[PDB]
Amino acid sequence: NAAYYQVVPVTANVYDSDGEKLSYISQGSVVWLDKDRKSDDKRLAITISGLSGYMKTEDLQALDASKDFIPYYESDGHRFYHYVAQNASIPVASHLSDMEVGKKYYSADGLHFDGFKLENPFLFKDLTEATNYSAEELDKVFSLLNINNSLLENKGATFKEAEEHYHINALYLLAHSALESNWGRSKIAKDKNNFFGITTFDDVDKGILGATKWIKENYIDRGRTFLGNKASGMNVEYASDPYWGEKIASVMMKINEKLGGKD
């Protein structure tokens, strides 16, 4: 058995030892062979984004570490990045003095490394905690990041109303909608009125409130109260992308930095 494998179908399921579905992951995702559990001809014991389970052998293609891309993490001396694909990165934390700049680090859960533990500032934050940011501050970020023709600009008051009503962090709501709609510039999102990529008040305001209600009832109220990864939080069920939670958290980080680090 190889050390790493890549997901073959559009999505594939991850199972427990008894064959019950635990989660699902996206095509091209790289999973780690887990040598501490038994793999056989039908299923491989694997780890992905915090989750340990089994995957069907026909769902996985063996990778060669010398030839193929293996995701890793690296610091530039200021920020630590997760490289999830050839050349593509997600900022996940500040640099720690424990990290050798330029060196590639590997982790099956994105938290525990060889020499240190990472505190991603938003990945495991309780999403029912309100943001410190005002409606007016949230609105400022579109200027500061040079985003234009966004249907989400001037929606700070809507996000804060959503936060007060449903008790879901407005910075998270802004981040989630920004990720799923290209900062409110997506034509698909406008035409479908679906800025969060779920399966006078205008349609955008109504969509934000409706999406927040949906997240509250289907995630928060069902015990999924933070972004997380494939082992826990919203990422277990919300998206096949095992690093969806990290992507949202990175958007929250970018917004927070630009607005002065109040959260």
Swiss-Prot record:
It comes from the Bacteria. Keywords: Cell wall biogenesis/degradation, Hydrolase, Repeat, Secreted, Signal. One of its GO terms (cellular component) is extracellular region. The keyword Transmembrane does not apply. One of its GO terms (biological process) is cell wall organization. It is found in: Secreted. One of its GO terms (molecular function) is mannosyl-glycoprotein endo-beta-N-acetylglucosaminidase activity. The keyword Hydrolase applies. Belongs to the glycosyl hydrolase 73 family. Plays an important role in cell wall degradation and cell separation. This is Putative endo-beta-N-acetylglucosaminidase. It comes from Streptococcus pneumoniae serotype 4 (strain ATCC BAA-334 / TIGR4). The lineage of its organism: Bacteria, Bacillati, Bacillota, Bacilli, Lactobacillales.
